[PDB]
Amino acid sequence: PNRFDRDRLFSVVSRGVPEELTGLLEYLRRTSKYLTDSAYTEGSTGKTCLMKAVLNLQDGVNACILPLLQIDRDSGNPQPLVNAQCTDEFYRGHSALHIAIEKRSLWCVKLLVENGANVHIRA
Numbered sequence: 705p706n707r708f709d710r711d712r713l714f715s716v717v718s719r720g721v722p723e724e725l726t727g728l729l730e731y732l733r734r735t736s737k738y739l740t741d742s743a744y745t746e747g748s749t750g751k752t753c754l755m756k757a758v759l760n761l762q763d764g765v766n767a768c769i770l771p772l773l774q775i776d777r778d779s780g781n782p783q784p785l786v787n788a789q790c791t792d793e794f795y796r797g798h799s800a801l802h803i804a805i806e807k808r809s810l811w812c813v814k815l816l817v818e819n820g821a822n823v824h825i826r827a
Contacts (some may be wrong), residue, residue, distance in 0.1 A: 706730055710744060717757040720768040721808045729775050740788060750790035758803045758812055769812060773819055787822045797827035 705727050708716075716724045728739075735744055745752045752757075754776075758771050776785055788801035801821050804812045817823075 706734065709774060709799065710746070713744070714721055714751050714756050717728070717753050717768050718760060720757070720760070720762065720766045721748065722768045722771045725775070727772045728772075729779070732775075738779065739776050740781050740785050742784050749764065749792050750788075751788050751800055752785050752788060754785050754799070756799045758800055758807065758809075761807065761809060761819065764809050764811065766812070771816060773815065784820055786816055786820055787825060790827070797825065798825070799827070800827045813817075 707728060708731055713728070732739060739753075753774055754769070757766055757772065760766075772785075786800060789795075789797050799822075801813065801816050801823070802825075804816050
């Protein structure tokens with residue numbers, strides 16, 4: 705339960721269950737890695753856990769977006785995975801705020817903007 709792979713956490717955030725997220729902080733603080741490192745996102749595209757959470761909302765509401773936010777703001781390296789975007793040539797610059805705006809959900813746009821969001825991110 706302590707160690708969580710990329711696919712495991714992607715599946716957890718796909719269902720939007722915060723209760724299955726009380727295993728991440730220990731994992732980050734044990735191996736002294738960062739949630740913003742190259743051990744949590746897909747290499748090809750760059751889709752992070754926060755983005756994959758934003759790609760699916762059951763009723764325009766996700767209770768799992770917040771827990772990632774407070775568990776990433778206590779140990780994040782200067783990028784809070786809010787200003788981090790894809791690296792592929794197709795989507796070079798596409799950040800989570802772009803998904804938030806595109807899905808037509810003002811709520812998550814807020815959650816992104818109070819917790820810090822460079823609005824001047826070019827896709």
